[PDB]
Amino acid sequence: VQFGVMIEKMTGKSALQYNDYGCYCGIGGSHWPVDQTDWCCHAHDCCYGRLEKLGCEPKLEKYLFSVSERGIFCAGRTTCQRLTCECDKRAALCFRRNLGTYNRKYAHYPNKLCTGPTPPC
Ligand SMILES: [Ca+2]
Ligand SMILES: [Ca+2]
Ligand SMILES: [Cl-]
Ligand SMILES: [Cl-]
Ligand SMILES: [Cl-]
Ligand SMILES: [Cl-]
Ligand SMILES: [Cl-]
Ligand SMILES: [Cl-]
Ligand SMILES: [Cl-]
Ligand SMILES: [Cl-]
């Protein structure tokens, strides 16, 4: 919902165009990322992992944000909510930055096609 709103504001695409992209976007992730957008998702998964190790529940946290001409501003009552926002912001910025190589063929990519090693965080 929130991450999804952020993705839409930053990329011009519906949130559904990222939610099962490549090997990393959406739940889980293994093998080698298909492209730069998928690397965004690999880094996002790593970011959430760091937050879980800090005591946060980033898959559940809800935060506040705005998008102005100046960028994305994150907020929230708790530090865990602000951290979750920051992980999402990095990923949404990374998606935007890689719009040029986004490929519709990797949307809803069947994870059975994912091959190669799993890069470490
Ligand atoms: Ca993932
Ligand atoms: Ca996929
Ligand atoms: Cl960091
Ligand atoms: Cl979580
Ligand atoms: Cl920003
Ligand atoms: Cl911020
Ligand atoms: Cl709250
Ligand atoms: Cl906290
Ligand atoms: Cl395309
Ligand atoms: Cl598109």
Residue numbers in the entry: 3 to 123
Q: What's written in the study?
A:
The mammalian family of secreted phospholipase A2 (sPLA2), which are Ca2+ dependent, low-molecular weight and disulfide-rich enzymes, plays key roles in many physiological functions and pathological processes by catalyzing the hydrolysis of phospholipids at the sn-2 position. GIIE, the closest homolog to GIIA, is regarded as a “hair follicular”, “inflammatory” and “metabolic” sPLA2. The structure of hGIIE consists of a typical set of three major helices (α1, α3 and α4), two β-strands (β1 and β2), and three short helices (α2, α5 and α6) around the second calcium binding site. Similar to hGIIA, hGIIE has seven disulfide bonds.
Two are apo-hGIIE structures at the resolution of 2.0 Å and 1.9 Å, with different crystallization conditions: without (apo-hGIIE_1) or with calcium (apo-hGIIE_2). In the apo-hGIIE_1 structure, crystallized in the condition without calcium, the Ca1 is surprisingly not fully occupied, with only 54% occupancy in this typical calcium binding site. In the apo-hGIIE_1 structure, the occupancy for Ca2 is 57%, which is six-coordinated by the carbonyl oxygen of Asp22, Gly24, Tyr111, carboxyl oxygen of Asp22, amide oxygen of Asn113, and one water molecule. In the apo-hGIIE_1 structure, Ca1 is only 54% occupied and the occupancy for Ca2 is 57%. This raises a possibility that calcium in the second binding site could move to the first calcium binding site when needed. Therefore, hGIIE may have a cost-effective way to use calcium, and Ca2 can act as backup to support the partially occupied Ca1. Similarly in apo-hGIIE structures, a water molecule, part of the second calcium hydration shell, forms a hydrogen bond to the carbonyl oxygen of Cys27 and links the second calcium to the oxyanion.
